[PDB]
Design a protein around this ligand. Structure first.
Ligand SMILES: [Cl-]
Ligand SMILES: [Cl-]
Length: 632
C-alpha cells in the first residue's frame, strides 16, 4: 500500500538512519496494515485496531486542539552564577523599562524539542510539525510494527533530512521498558540540546500505561537534564587550584594498579557509629591500611590511630581550614594525602607527602591531566567515595567500611519538608537517610561492583545497606594479614605513585595559549548571536555545536571555561522571549538580548584575560572569588 511512498521512505532511512533502515528492510511484521471503514489506514492484530473507527480524526483533533495549552508542555522557570545573574537582570530591566511585560505561558506555539510518546501510524506528525517547527524531534515507539507500517503513511524524508548535518536532531527510540525509555529520552535531549527544554511539546500517540508514565517521568526529568555545566568562576578556581598544586614542589600522581594487594584496607568515614568500632580499628592498624576520609581523621587521631592515607575531594578554603585545625590539634604524622588535583593548594603544607588524582569533567582535567590512567571514576559525590575508589584503583580488594553510615538508625505540620527517607539498614531494620547520602551510597556500591568478584567488601558501619558489601559486626572481624604484609603492600603502592616535576606542569601548561582559545571561542558565540538573533532554534543549534558536542571529541579547556555560563544565559533569554508581550514588539526584546549577550561576552573576555595574567599571584580561592565578585 503506497509502494512509491514506502520505497521513498525506506530509502531515506537507509541513507540517513542506516541501522534503522536496515532493520526496517528485513522486518516481517506480526500485525496487519488494513483499510478501515472510514477508508483510513489502520493496524489490525487479532481483531484489535490501533485507531478503530474515527481514531484518525480523534488523534488529529487532539494535535490541533493542544497547540497552546501549558498542560502538554514543559514549563521550566529559569531559577546560576554572577555573570548570568547580571545578564538576566539587565534584559528584564530594559524590557520592563521599555513597556514590555512577560506572560506566565507563551501565547505562541514553538519550542526547540518535540517529544512523541508513541508514533502509531503518525497521523499526528504533520500537524505537530507545522505548529511547532521543532529543531529536535524524539519519537518513542515501543512497537516496531507501527514504525514499519508508518512507512505507508508518514512523509519521513523531510524528518530524516534533519539528521544530515546533525543526527542528534531526530531520535527514534524503540524500547518497551520504562527504565530504558526514560534513559534514552534523557539522552536524546541531553545530546541534542539540553538547555532549552522550555515549552517542549509532549504528545501521546495512543493509549498506553507505558507511554503515559514515560511522559510523566520525562516532565519531572526535563528540568534536571540541562544542569551541571560548570560556571566560569568555578572553572577559574579549579584550574587555579590545579595550576598551583602542580607548578612547584614534590608531589606524585595516582596510577591504577593491574595487580591485587592482599593487605586489607579500612575505609573510615565520619559517621558516628565509629565509636563502637574504634577499639577494633586500633587493635588492627598494625596489619591493615587505614584510609581516612575527610573529617574522619579527627576521631582516628584523637584515639591514637595513624591514617596511612588521608583523602580529600573538595576544593575550597573551608575543607582546608577543617583539615588544618585537625593538624594543629593532633598532627598527621606520616600520613600521605591523596587528593583531587583541585584541592586547596595550601593542603600540601599540612602533609609530609601529597599524591593527586585527576578529577574528570572540569577545565582542570582537560588542561592538566596527563591521561585517563591517572583519574578515578566514582570519586564523588563525597570523600568516602574518593577513598573507596582510590583503594580499589591502588589494588586493594579486601575492604572494611567504618563510619560510612550515610544515615541514622531509627530512633498536620506547617514546616512540612521531608528531611529523610527510610532505607534498609546495614544491620537490618531501617535507617533515615538524605538524598546526598543515597547518591554516595549508590556510588559506593557501583564502584565496588566493578571489581567483583576479586573485591570482597565488608560494612561494619551501623547505617544504610550498601550494595556489593556484606554486613559484618566489627567484633567478628578477623584478618589474615601481618605487619610485614602491610609494609610490603605499602611499598608497592608507594612505588606506583608517579613523581610530579615541573616537567609535567610545563608539558601541560605551555602546549596552548589558553586565554587566546577562550577569547576566540567567546568571539565566535558573540558572532553567532549577531548572525542568528531572532531565530531561536538556529541560534541554539549554532551555540550548541560550538560549546557542547562532547561525544565526537572531548571538550576543550575553552569549552569547559565558558559553556556553563553561556548556556545558562541562553536558557534565560529563551524562556523570556517566548513570553514577551506585546508580541509585535518581540524584535525589540531580541535586540536587547543581543546587546546584553555582547556585554556579557565582553565582561567574560576581560575576566578571562585578567585571570590568566594573575593565575599565579592569587593568594587563595577566596581572594579570586572576592575580586570577580566585586567586578564593576
Ligand atoms: Cl592479580
Ligand atoms: Cl529499625
Amino acid at each position: 500500500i503506497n509502494a512509491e511512498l514506502v520505497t521513498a521512505n525506506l530509502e531515506a532511512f537507509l541513507e540517513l538512519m542506516p541501522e534503522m533502515g536496515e532493520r526496517l528492510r528485513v522486518h516481517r511484521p506480526q500485525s496487519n496494515l488494513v483499510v478501515n471503514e472510514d477508508g483510513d489506514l489502520d493496524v489490525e492484530f487479532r481483531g484489535e485496531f490501533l485507531y478503530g473507527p474515527g481514531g484518525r480524526k480523534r488523534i488529529e483533533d487532539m494535535a490541533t486542539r493542544t497547540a497552546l495549552g501549558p498542560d502538554h508542555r514543559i514549563s521550566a522557570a529559569p531559577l546560576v552564577d554572577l555573570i548570568v545573574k547580571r545578564f538576566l537582570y539587565n534584559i528584564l530591566k530594559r524590557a520592563t523599562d521599555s513597556g514590555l511585560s512577560f506572560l506566565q505561558h507563551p501565547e505562541e506555539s514553538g519550542g526547540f524539542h518535540m517529544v512523541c510518546l508513541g508514533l502509531g501510524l503518525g497521523y499526528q506528525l504533520p500537524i505537530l510539525l507545522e505548529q511547532d517547527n521543532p529543531a529536535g524531534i524524539h519519537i518513542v515507539e515501543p512497537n516496531f510494527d507501527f514504525l514499519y507500517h508508518s512507512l505507508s503513511t508518514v512523509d519521513w524524508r523531510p524528518l530524516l533530512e534533519t539528521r544530515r548535518e546533525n543526527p542528534l536532531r531526530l531520535n527514534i527510540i524503540i524500547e518497551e521498558e520504562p527504565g530504558q525509555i526514560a534513559r534514552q529520552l534523557r539522552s536524546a535531549i541531553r545530546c541534542c540540546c539540553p538547555i532549552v527544554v522550555d515549552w517542549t511539546r509532549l504528545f501521546v500517540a495512543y493509549n498506553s500505561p507505558l507511554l503515559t508514565a514515560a511522559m510523566s517521568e520525562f516532565m519531572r526529568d526535563a528540568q534536571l537534564i540541562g544542569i551541571g555545566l560548570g560556571f566560569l568562576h568555578d572553572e577559574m578556581e579549579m584550574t587555579r587550584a590545579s595550576y598551583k598544586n602542580m607548578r612547584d614542589g614534590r608531589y606524585s600522581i595516582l596510577q591504577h594498579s593491574a595487580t591485587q594487594l592482599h593487605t586489607p584496607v579500612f575505609i573510615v568515614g565520619s559517621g558516628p557509629s565509629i565509636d563502637d568500632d574504634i577499639e577494633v580499628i586500633k587493635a588492627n592498624q598494625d596489619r591493615a591500611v587505614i584510609i581516612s576520609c575527610g573529617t574522619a581523621s579527627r576521631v582516628l587521631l584523637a584515639n591514637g590511630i595513624q591514617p596511612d592515607f588521608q583523602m580529600l575531594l573538595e576544593n575550597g578554603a573551608a575543607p582546608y581550614r577543617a583539615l588544618a585545625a585537625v593538624h594543629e590539634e593532633f598532627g598527621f604524622g606520616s600520613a600521605t594525602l591523596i587528593g583531587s588535583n583541585t584541592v586547596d593548594p595550601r593542603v600540601r603544607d599540612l602533609f609530609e607527602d601529597v599524591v593527586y588524582y585527576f578529577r574528570p569533567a572540569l577545565s582542570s582535567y582537560a588542561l592538566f591531566s596527563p591521561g585517563i590512567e591517572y583519574s578515578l571514576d566514582d570519586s564523588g559525590p563525597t570523600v568516602t567515595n574518593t577513598g573507596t575508589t582510590a583503594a580499589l584503583a591502588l589494588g586493594f580488594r579486601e575492604l572494611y567500611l567504618f563510619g560510612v553510615d550515610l544515615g541514622s538508625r531509627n530512633p498536620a505540620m506547617d514546616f512540612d519538608a521531608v528531611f529523610d527517607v527510610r532505607e534498609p539498614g546495614n544491620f537490618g531494620g531501617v535507617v533515615y537517610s538524605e538524598t546526598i547520602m543515597l547518591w554516595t551510597r549508590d556510588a559506593l556500591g557501583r564502584i565496588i561492583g566493578r571489581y567483583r568478584p576479586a573485591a570482597n567488601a565488608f560494612n561494619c558501619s551501623d547505617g544504610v545497606m550498601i550494595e556489593n558489601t556484606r554486613p559484618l559486626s566489627s567484633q567478628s572481624l578477623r584478618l589474615k594479614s601481618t605487619p610485614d604484609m602491610k609494609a610490603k603492600d605499602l611499598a608497592k603502592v608507594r612505588a606506583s605513585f608517579r613523581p610530579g616535576g615541573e616537567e609535567l606542569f610545563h608539558d601541560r601548561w605551555d602546549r596552548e595559549d589558553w586565554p587566546r582559545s577562550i577569547v576566540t571561542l567567546l568571539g565566535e558565540c558573540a558572532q553567532a548571536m549577531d548572525d542568528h538573533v531572532g531565530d531561536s532554534n538556529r541560534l541554539m543549534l549554532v551555540l550548541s555545536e560550538m560549546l557542547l558536542r562532547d561525544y565526537k571529541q572531548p571538550p576543550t579547556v575553552a569549552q569547559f571555561f565558558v559553556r556553563g555560563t553561556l548556556m545558562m544565559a541562553a536558557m534565560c533569554y529563551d524562556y523570556y522571549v517566548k513570553r514577551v508581550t506585546p508580541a509585535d514588539r518581540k524584535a525589540e526584546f531580541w535586540e536587547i538580548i543581543r546587546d546584553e549577550f555582547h556585554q556579557m561576552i565582553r565582561v567574560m573576555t576581560l575576566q578571562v584575560e585578567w585571570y590568566f595574567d594573575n593565575i599565579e599571584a592569587f593568594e587563595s580561592d577566596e581572594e579570586l572569588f572576592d575580586k570577580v565578585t566585586g567586578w564593576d
